[PDB]
Amino acid sequence: FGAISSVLNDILSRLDPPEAEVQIDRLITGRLQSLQTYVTQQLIRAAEI
């Protein structure tokens, strides 16, 4: 998602708590958006069923 790496641990194991929260913010933004897209898809097909 434009952050440094896809492992939470590697961001934690290499960067600083004054720094890493920007990367973590990017991670949770991207993953949260994907999850909300998923629940939209499933709920629409549920209406179809």
Binding site: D16, P17, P18, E19
Partner: protein
């Protein structure tokens, strides 16, 4: 234009070259051994040289700083302990070794 519960004025004197480590989240011996600021900080930092005030040609050797520690210190923690630090794996007793 703002109002506060109370204020803290924390005062000391340091070497000039280390002044950059005063920001929260910084590292280094000053930032990690004797003074540590938490990262939720809301205040100001202020520095000026006192070169004409205290700095004497003979040497102002009452200005000590803590150069060794077993561990890092908490934010707004102050250490005064003069127990001897051991660096090597050899344990030590008494005063010097």
């Amino acid at each position: 234009d703002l109002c506060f519960t109370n204020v803290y004025a924390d005062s000391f004197v340091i070497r000039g070259d280390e002044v950059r480590q005063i920001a929260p989240g910084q590292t280094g011996v000053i930032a990690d051994y004797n003074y540590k600021l938490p990262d939720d900080f809301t205040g100001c930092v202020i520095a000026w040289n006192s070169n004409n005030l205290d700095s004497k040609v003979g040497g102002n050797y009452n200005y000590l700083y803590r150069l060794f520690r077993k561990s890092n210190l908490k934010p707004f923690e102050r250490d005064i302990s003069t127990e001897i630090y051991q660096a090597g794996s050899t344990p030590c007793n008494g005063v010097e070794g």
